[PDB]
Amino acid sequence: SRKTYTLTDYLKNTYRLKLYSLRWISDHEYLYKQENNILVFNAEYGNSSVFLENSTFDEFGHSINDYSISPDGQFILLEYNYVKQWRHSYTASYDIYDLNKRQLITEERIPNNTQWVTWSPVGHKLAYVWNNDIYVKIEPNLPSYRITWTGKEDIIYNGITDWVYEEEVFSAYSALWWSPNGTFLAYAQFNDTEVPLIEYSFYSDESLQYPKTVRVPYPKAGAVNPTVKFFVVNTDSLSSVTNATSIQITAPASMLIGDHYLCDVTWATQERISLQWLRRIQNYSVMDICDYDESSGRWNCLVARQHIEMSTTGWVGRFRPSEPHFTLDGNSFYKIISNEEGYRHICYFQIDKKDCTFITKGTWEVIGIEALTSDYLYYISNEYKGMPGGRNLYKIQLSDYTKVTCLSCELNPERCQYYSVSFSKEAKYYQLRCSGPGLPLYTLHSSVNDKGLRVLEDNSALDKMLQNVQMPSKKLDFIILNETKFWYQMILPPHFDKSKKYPLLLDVYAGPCSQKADTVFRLNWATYLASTENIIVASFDGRGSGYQGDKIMHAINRRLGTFEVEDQIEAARQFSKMGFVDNKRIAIWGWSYGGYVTSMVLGSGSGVFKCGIAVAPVSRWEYYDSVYTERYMGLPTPEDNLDHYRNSTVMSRAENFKQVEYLLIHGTADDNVHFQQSAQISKALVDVGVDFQAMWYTDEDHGIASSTAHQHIYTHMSHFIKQCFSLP
Amino acid sequence: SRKTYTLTDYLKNTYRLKLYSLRWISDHEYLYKQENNILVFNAEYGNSSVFLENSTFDEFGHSINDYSISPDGQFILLEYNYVKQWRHSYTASYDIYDLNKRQLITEERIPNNTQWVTWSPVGHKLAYVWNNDIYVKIEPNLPSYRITWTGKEDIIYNGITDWVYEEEVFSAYSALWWSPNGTFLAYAQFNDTEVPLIEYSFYSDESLQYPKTVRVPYPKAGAVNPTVKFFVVNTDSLSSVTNATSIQITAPASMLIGDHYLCDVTWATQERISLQWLRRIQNYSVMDICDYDESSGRWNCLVARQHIEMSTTGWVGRFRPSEPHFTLDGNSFYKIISNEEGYRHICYFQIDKKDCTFITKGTWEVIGIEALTSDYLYYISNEYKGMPGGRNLYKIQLSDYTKVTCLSCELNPERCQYYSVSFSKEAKYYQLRCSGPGLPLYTLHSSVNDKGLRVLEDNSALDKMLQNVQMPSKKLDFIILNETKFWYQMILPPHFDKSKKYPLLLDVYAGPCSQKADTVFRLNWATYLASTENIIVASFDGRGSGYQGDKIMHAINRRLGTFEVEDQIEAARQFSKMGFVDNKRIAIWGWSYGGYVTSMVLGSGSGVFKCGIAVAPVSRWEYYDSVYTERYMGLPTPEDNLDHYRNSTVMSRAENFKQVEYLLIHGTADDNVHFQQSAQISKALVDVGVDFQAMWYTDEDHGIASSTAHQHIYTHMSHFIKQCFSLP
Numbered sequence A, B: 001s002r003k004t005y006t007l008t009d010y011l012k013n014t015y016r017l018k019l020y021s022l023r024w025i026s027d028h029e030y031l032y033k034q035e036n037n038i039l040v041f042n043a044e045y046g047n048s049s050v051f052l053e054n055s056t057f058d059e060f061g062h063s064i065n066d067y068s069i070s071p072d073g074q075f076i077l078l079e080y081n082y083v084k085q086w087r088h089s090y091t092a093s094y095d096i097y098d099l100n101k102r103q104l105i106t107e108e109r110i111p112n113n114t115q116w117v118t119w120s121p122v123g124h125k126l127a128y129v130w131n132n133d134i135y136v137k138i139e140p141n142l143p144s145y146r147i148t149w150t151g152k153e154d155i156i157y158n159g160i161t162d163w164v165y166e167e168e169v170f171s172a173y174s175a176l177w178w179s180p181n182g183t184f185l186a187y188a189q190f191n192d193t194e195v196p197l198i199e200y201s202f203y204s205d206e207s208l209q210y211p212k213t214v215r216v217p218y219p220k221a222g223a224v225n226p227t228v229k230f231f232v233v234n235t236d237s238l239s240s241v242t243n244a245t246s247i248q249i250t251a252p253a254s255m256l257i258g259d260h261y262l263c264d265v266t267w268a269t270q271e272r273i274s275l276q277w278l279r280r281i282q283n284y285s286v287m288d289i290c291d292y293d294e295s296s297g298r299w300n301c302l303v304a305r306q307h308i309e310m311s312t313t314g315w316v317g318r319f320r321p322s323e324p325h326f327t328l329d330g331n332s333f334y335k336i337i338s339n340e341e342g343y344r345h346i347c348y349f350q351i352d353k354k355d356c357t358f359i360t361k362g363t364w365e366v367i368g369i370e371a372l373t374s375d376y377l378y379y380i381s382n383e384y385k386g387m388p389g390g391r392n393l394y395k396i397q398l399s400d401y402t403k404v405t406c407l408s409c410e411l412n413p414e415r416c417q418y419y420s421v422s423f424s425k426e427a428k429y430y431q432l433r434c435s436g437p438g439l440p441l442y443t444l445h446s447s448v449n450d451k452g453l454r455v456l457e458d459n460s461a462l463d464k465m466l467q468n469v470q471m472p473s474k475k476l477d478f479i480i481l482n483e484t485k486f487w488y489q490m491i492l493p494p495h496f497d498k499s500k501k502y503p504l505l506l507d508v509y510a511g512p513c514s515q516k517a518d519t520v521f522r523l524n525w526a527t528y529l530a531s532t533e534n535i536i537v538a539s540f541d542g543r544g545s546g547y548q549g550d551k552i553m554h555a556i557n558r559r560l561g562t563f564e565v566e567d568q569i570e571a572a573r574q575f576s577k578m579g580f581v582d583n584k585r586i587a588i589w590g591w592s593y594g595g596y597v598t599s600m601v602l603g604s605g606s607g608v609f610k611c612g613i614a615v616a617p618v619s620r621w622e623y624y625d626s627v628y629t630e631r632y633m634g635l636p637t638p639e640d641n642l643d644h645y646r647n648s649t650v651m652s653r654a655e656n657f658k659q660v661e662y663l664l665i666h667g668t669a670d671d672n673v674h675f676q677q678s679a680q681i682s683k684a685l686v687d688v689g690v691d692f693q694a695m696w697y698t699d700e701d702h703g704i705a706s707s708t709a710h711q712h713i714y715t716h717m718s719h720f721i722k723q724c725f726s727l728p
């Protein structure tokens, strides 16, 4: 198709995928911003109109990062002066704008450097977090009510997570949950008082004479972890002369024994909250159920509805105990659980009753429960064609669980093997969004008789542009190792020719529960490598990999740096046998867990790879954080799993590097995998007399994502591979 | 046929230079350590005896790092548990061995973590520093007297210097100066209370879970400086329980007007000190003469007896106002000063008069006064044959200044052209140490008729080994640029042949008062480049270079990264117009200041260089320390010299680096030229999209000098030069 997909096209975004991000605001309407206008849509009919004009804030004077609309459609939150913190957190300013009038509010404004903000789920109350304390507004134009007074930077967090909770437990800065009435505000409070602090330089702009030292509470593995407390306050009982009254809910005594985590927080009904908890030695969690006592005003959790989950082979849940999905009345819920064969399925729980009933089962896994109505439960799994990297939507009749409908398997079976979904409030409508193998297709439907309504977006534009490029092809397949199947994917250069030998670059991640072999459509680096440089790009999902049951997933339990490393090697060997691969030119590379695995692979002495790149690699598990590391490794004590903690470092393999060409890269402001970790890799390579190449990116973190640094590192990595593979 | 000088020869020191390190101890004897027996030799006769048995200190229990023997021979200091700090500073433990007994003194020991210790000039009194306070012992087995009570880590330093004074002002950690009676202890006090701290990560051994932040009071250019007070205590009247009295000496009104530095302390007699002071703007310095007053017990500094040295053309001194050398009676003294043609010559001062009288003159410079007796002054200069990179000893008859005898020019004229020297007390004898161009040669001589006594080390062993390798040879000569002579050296491949075209490396330092072209013999990276890889390694002495007078030396005044930079560029061109260097393979490298200059050239756009390497470079003068920077740049304020501080960074030239292949190396624990400087270089290149190479050395500092990091950086640099020069 003559011209090729270029390094510059990736870096510059020549070919963009369209998306269709809607926001349901009721059971039959969604908002959609187009250019900078907000449109309101009707799902059953497809008519549409302008909710807010792109022009409405022309004379605002501050550039607008985002907006949130109140659920009654009365006000809109305006977020400007955004400042990124870590992966999810950030600070920003807010102005609220009243819709039925056309006024901004001068009165009682949210303060600058607000840390989190959220509207109640119904009405137009606001709850915010400033300076680490919680605040509530009953009406946008009124004075707020301070709910906490303990707030203190880096030590006391009311209503927002600290560094580990944010990164490894909630995946969010928020630690507030409104009851559905908007009556109650539950919230969480963290105390980092004794958490050791990571310290690193931040150089900033040229004009800064002295580098700033950044300092952040971060529990490295086996160190003191933050403590957590849970409160619920009643939002309809606030006063200006009287302080807010918070009712604490205590973890259960089976948690209280020792260090633990608050793991999940789910409103069931107006007067019932679910709370899930986990022991630090993450193989035990307790679901508690808490009720409001109208008279007492208290919240009580009855030890008899307490549910328990344990793992015999590993940790609990994929990354954490699953989310509970409650039936409307709050008396029962559905939740994904590993089963007696080790495959993850949905279990039905009745509240005061023992055991649970499996309503799905088989050799495959449910990825998620998506919606639950009186007559149906909706979920997603990789059942179809028995493909672990395929994803489809299913419908289960609740009156008879043997009646399962695939809503997605056949809409477009050659283009569409990998969907997600977004049901409306109450579920009378849904958007399907297919991600591959073909170009992303977004459709709307009515759950009534799963009728298709409209196409929303088909990226037809992009399909026509791509016709003019010589595009690679993606092969998705597997190899049988012991009597087991491990899946791999190859991205092949156009005009692929099994009669010719191509070099191969192995793209690895392979952390616990990962999947690097799927049916998704991507435009990315590997797109340029196979299209312009004609290199094959291979990913392999071996032991330790996810969505295929616990026997594969838990095989790496307490053993990081083994099975997952071995298997990547082995898959490369196999790839060789395959007559179309130059075994003198096989490489490896990876980011984050992937850098760690590539380094350990580069250091095995296998002989299989000529070279490899490691970006932001973990190098010794004692350096990464407690919640993630400990899930897999237990604790670094002689009494628990210290010996394998020490047997799995990159450093100890340094002499083996004399055998390969290695490129090691890190941002010096990485607040997640510390620059420290590659600093110790390079020093070990130095102590042993082994030459390597290196690159640091000053002031970048784990995502090395500024446009300038992102263009630069991929440009730098393109050169190193090109030259490793003798390619001009 | 012979073997070549390999990278491994250099790194492993296969070919070692022999030395002859001796310490004079009377006017006729010296100590010399041999087969680790300490020997005392007789200079006149050559004969030797065992001063301290090698056997002693075998069962001592620790390894001994150095030693120091009382002046009036009763005792010896043993240094162990040595732990280095910065360029000159360190901490250590101390044992004392009483010679006239076979005994280590067991009582009233010098404490561990001692910071500085010193015998008085006669007898056996001890002064030491511990926790930043000074202590005196009159006798080795008795209680010490505490002289200061104000010491405080990183804030108040008594009798030791702080970071800048160690590095830039006194070149030693020490700030104690005993009187010649040993009656008086003088000592400076530095106060760093409001000096900002540079802060950097230090990673240690892999077992350290969290990185430590190093914090060092370090004045960057234009910041607040430490301050200094100056004291003199009488060692003869100290009381058991009574607190000692230290009498203060005030800097003179013309310095107290603003910031200044103490730069020189020199005892003239038993009761007369000399202190030189220097303004922050280093244009004006003052010498004060203090006389002890029998009646008041005070020290008085007669204004009318002050001596003033200003500069209109630059700063004062080569790096700082020079040392005065006092006549035995302390009423006049000698000291190097820039004459009117701007050449540095010895000038004679009489204490209560006001001018001085020159004693040498000419279009060459004196480099140091080395010895003074009632009948002669001895100094080193570069007079011989007009070669400024040469160095020889001369003698001047005080009774007639034109009576000058060159003592070292004709000893071994082909082999020896770069001498230094070391006289006995009173100069009855002296060691000459030739450093090239041939193998170093050490001789002992008698002062009365200046006769050769013996050869002490001639490096014959090395002579024999070296006949078996193909050693490069050194060319030294000069070029004319705009009417003036500028010297360069070339290191040349063996069996060199001027009809062939060799690649050239330009090795640059080029700092103010530097000299990279001279007549000394070195075995170094360059030897290897020329002997194994056939690369001509050139160095050049441009404007700003030293030892050739102020017109060349001050031409860079207030303008760093200017002429010193154009000049290296011009020399390379000229080398290019040589019929034996190919202009396709000219590269350039340098450390420190030289890295700054290497980066500036690389970014000049000249087109002269294919590639270069910068190791630990300055990138922006606002980042380097006050004393040295301001010395040449003045202050970074708009009212002063800001504009050129802003115009002379490496970052500003980033866009040109696309024309060149650049390797940037910097240690992470560099307390001197901070890592931050390179961090900024690399960030500017990235912002602008230039690709380049990099290497960081974890925990190394400005010398990247641990044995493995040294092995590794030169290895790394070699691969990078060879490839740039297409050398297999």
Ligand SMILES: COc1cc(OC)cc(-c2nc(N)c(CN)c(-c3ccc(Cl)cc3Cl)n2)c1
Pocket (backbone or CB within 6 Å): A167, A168, A509, A511, A592, A593, A618, A624, A628, A672, A673
């Ligand atoms: C591999 O691709 C992705 C994509 C993601 O979505 C952006 C998140 C992650 C992701 N998120 C996290 N919160 C974490 C936990 N720290 C991780 C992760 C897992 C393992 C390691 Cl060693 C490091 C990290 Cl960051 N990885 C990884």
Ligand SMILES: COc1cc(OC)cc(-c2nc(N)c(CN)c(-c3ccc(Cl)cc3Cl)n2)c1
Pocket (backbone or CB within 6 Å): B167, B168, B509, B511, B592, B593, B618, B624, B628, B672, B673, B702
């Ligand atoms: C040319 O290489 C050498 C050799 C030295 O003696 C071994 C000292 C120095 C030396 N000593 C010093 N005290 C200093 C003062 N900062 C310097 C120096 C000069 C300039 C710069 Cl930009 C940096 C340094 Cl470290 N360089 C340099």
Ligand SMILES: *[C@@H]1O[C@H](CO)[C@@H](O)[C@H](O)[C@H]1NC(C)=O
Pocket (backbone or CB within 6 Å): A040, A041, A042, A045, A047, A048, A049
């Ligand atoms: C859709 O059109 C119907 C009929 O006019 C109207 O009632 C409704 O408000 C329209 N909705 C939107 C969202 O534009």
Ligand SMILES: *[C@@H]1O[C@H](CO)[C@@H](O)[C@H](O)[C@H]1NC(C)=O
Pocket (backbone or CB within 6 Å): A093, A109, A110, A111, A112
């Ligand atoms: C926030 O800061 C801006 C500018 O500094 C100020 O004008 C605004 O009124 C401040 N506080 C708010 C928005 O409540």
Ligand SMILES: *[C@@H]1O[C@H](CO)[C@@H](O)[C@H](O)[C@H]1NC(C)=O
Pocket (backbone or CB within 6 Å): A150, A156, A191, A193, A194
């Ligand atoms: C946080 O924990 C520390 C240590 O246990 C305790 O002393 C401190 O008072 C706590 N603060 C709060 C508000 O919980």
Ligand SMILES: *[C@@H]1O[C@H](CO)[C@@H](O)[C@H](O)[C@H]1NC(C)=O
Pocket (backbone or CB within 6 Å): A149, A241, A242, A243
């Ligand atoms: C409000 O309550 C908190 C504790 O609940 C207290 O510390 C603070 O001072 C109170 N102030 C008032 C208004 O009572």
Ligand SMILES: *[C@@H]1O[C@H](CO)[C@@H](O)[C@H](O)[C@H]1NC(C)=O
Pocket (backbone or CB within 6 Å): B040, B041, B042, B045, B047, B048, B049
């Ligand atoms: C040198 O020999 C002379 C002659 O005996 C002797 O007196 C002197 O002490 C000896 N000195 C040394 C250094 O051994």
Ligand SMILES: *[C@@H]1O[C@H](CO)[C@@H](O)[C@H](O)[C@H]1NC(C)=O
Pocket (backbone or CB within 6 Å): B093, B109, B110, B111, B112
């Ligand atoms: C010095 O250190 C040694 C061990 O290094 C210790 O035993 C001793 O008490 C310390 N104190 C001294 C000797 O001043």
Ligand SMILES: *[C@@H]1O[C@H](CO)[C@@H](O)[C@H](O)[C@H]1NC(C)=O
Pocket (backbone or CB within 6 Å): B150, B156, B191, B192, B193, B194
């Ligand atoms: C050091 O200087 C600070 C002010 O810069 C002053 O407060 C302090 O007294 C001084 N300390 C001493 C012991 O001189």
Ligand SMILES: *[C@H]1O[C@H](CO)[C@@H](O)[C@H](O)[C@H]1NC(C)=O
Pocket (backbone or CB within 6 Å): B035, B036, B037, B054
């Ligand atoms: C010490 O000196 C003796 C006497 O010559 C020498 O022969 C021996 O090798 C030396 N021993 C040590 C430990 O160096």
